[PDB]
Amino acid sequence: TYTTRQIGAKNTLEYKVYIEKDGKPVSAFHDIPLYADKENNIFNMVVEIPRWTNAKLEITKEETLNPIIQDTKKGKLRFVRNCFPHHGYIHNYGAFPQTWEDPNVSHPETKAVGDNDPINVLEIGETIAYTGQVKQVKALGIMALLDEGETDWKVIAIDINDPLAPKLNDIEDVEKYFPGLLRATNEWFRIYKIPDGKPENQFAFSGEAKNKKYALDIIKETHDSWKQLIAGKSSDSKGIDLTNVTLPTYSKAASDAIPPASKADAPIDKSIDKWFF
Amino acid sequence: TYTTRQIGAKNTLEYKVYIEKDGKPVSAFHDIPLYADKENNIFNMVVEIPRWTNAKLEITKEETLNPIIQDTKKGKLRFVRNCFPHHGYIHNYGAFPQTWEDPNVSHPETKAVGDNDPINVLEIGETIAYTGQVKQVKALGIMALLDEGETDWKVIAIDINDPLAPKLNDIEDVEKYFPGLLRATNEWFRIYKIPDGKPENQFAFSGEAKNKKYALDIIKETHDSWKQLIAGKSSDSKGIDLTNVTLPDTPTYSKAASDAIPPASLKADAPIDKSIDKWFFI
Ligand SMILES: [Mg+2]
Ligand SMILES: [Mg+2]
Ligand SMILES: [Mg+2]
């Protein structure tokens, strides 16, 4: 059973969420199996950012057991800005554990190296998720984002508990039941860092969302990129912390070393409300 | 100075917010002056609903001193649903005090009676407002919504403290600094009750946002309807509570109605049913 352990107040530098299996911290990167049901391609998704929020929370590569923390740039907490007509993130946002966009090789589909992170997942169901949630999802398709010039696939997925899950099996069903969401998704990932002073991003395949079979192939490829990583068979592991507790860099002590749970959400600066056009 | 007095937890049937002056309740409908600065057309806006929220909090006409209370439909808390690509309300939303969309006459611009409420205001500035806030706004323009067949004008306004306020003087400026916003606003008010099983709403003038001059004329009309209402001279005041604490020449003036209000009993926001998360694709 997966739960969460929160250290600190949300929206501060001290905030961390560890995932616990039966009350014991595990690595959110390496210790949650990618497959909840391999035979039926049901994946475990680690939720980082709930729909309609701004705080850029993420599994951190360089801390032990890879807790979810807030991204920073040069000491300042990162909040993704509101880009009209969108409010924060327009998906439940996260990653599949046990995957890696390998930064050391060029991906033939996009002519770019990977962004060094677990492959990202856009979960499109009704219910807003919580940071640190491990949910079970089916993959519907995939989009090829070049994120400041690096391969940054976005899997389009739905919670198997969603009322619509039985009617959603491939990328075409997203167009049926969520008309406009794929367009909005294309726009969002293109422009979301312009308010930060970064360039517009671009997608390979003219922004096309590839179907489920294509997505399963890419996911399995990043999962293999991950098996080379965790084996220490890396030409360059890029400072990632490879410690784990359910599985070399294995270290069963790591789970007891995590501090105990703690605070109410801290205030967010009013500037984060602003809608950019 | 204006403050709030909250009774109960937000997102419950018991929740109420009264607006206070000098720490004592006044009527949110009747006692807050329409104009903060008459000579410069600066209005007091009563905020009901913050941008990007759902709970349909509104001034309560039929309750003494007209506190803001969550609307209900057949007794259940009313939450406006999320209609893609929007999240809840896309403006800080509320009303001008001392106005009324007269329900007893057909309004010439729309050929329909009024929706029996204070004129509504969409405040477009960057900072998210709070329920019971009295802010000072400039009017920029106005749209003629027919909300379930009733005249329901929406003033386009901006907080005078917004960084952009000095650059926003008329309706054309909204399109310049907020491109797509007026178009989205037209869509929002057409579709927002479709998830409630209501028909699509309609606008007069094919949704055109009329300019500031036009807006000021309609705001005056609604202020005049209210002057008649509060004096006890409406042909049918619809059971509205006209009790006030600042208008001595009215039959329903009573400074002591303020003393009768219970003290604040502010509790933490109650949970909202997860169904309200849902994004509706219309
Ligand atoms: Mg990043
Ligand atoms: Mg990424
Ligand atoms: Mg109205």
UniProtKB/Swiss-Prot annotation, chain B:
Give residues annotated as binding diphosphate: 78
Q: Where does Mg(2+) 2 bind?
A: 120
Primary localization class, coarse: cytoplasm
Is 4Fe-4S one of the keywords?
no
Domain of life, per the record? Eukaryota
Cross-link Glycyl lysine isopeptide (Lys-Gly) (interchain with G-Cter in ubiquitin): residue positions: 238, 278
Q: Which reaction does it catalyse?
A: diphosphate + H2O = 2 phosphate + H(+)
Q: Which GO terms describe its molecular function?
A: inorganic diphosphate phosphatase activity; magnesium ion binding
UniProt modified residues of type Phosphothreonine: 64, 250
Residues annotated as binding Mg(2+) 1 are: 115, 120, 152
One term under GO cellular component: nucleus
Q: Where is the active site?
A: 89 (proton donor)
Localization of this protein: Cytoplasm
> Could you tell me the keywords of this UniProt record?
Cytoplasm, Hydrolase, Isopeptide bond, Magnesium, Metal-binding, Phosphoprotein, Ubl conjugation
Which residues get modified to Phosphoserine? 265
**A single BP term in Gene Ontology:** phosphate-containing compound metabolic process
What are the EC numbers?
3.6.1.1
Necessary cofactors: Mg(2+)
Q: Which family does it belong to?
A: Belongs to the PPase family.
**Other comments on record:** Present with 68400 molecules/cell in log phase SD medium.
Instruction: Provide the assembly information.
Output: Homodimer.
- Tell me which PANTHER family the record gives: INORGANIC PYROPHOSPHATASE
Q: What is this protein called?
A: Inorganic pyrophosphatase
Question: Which organism encodes this protein?
Answer: Saccharomyces cerevisiae (strain ATCC 204508 / S288c)
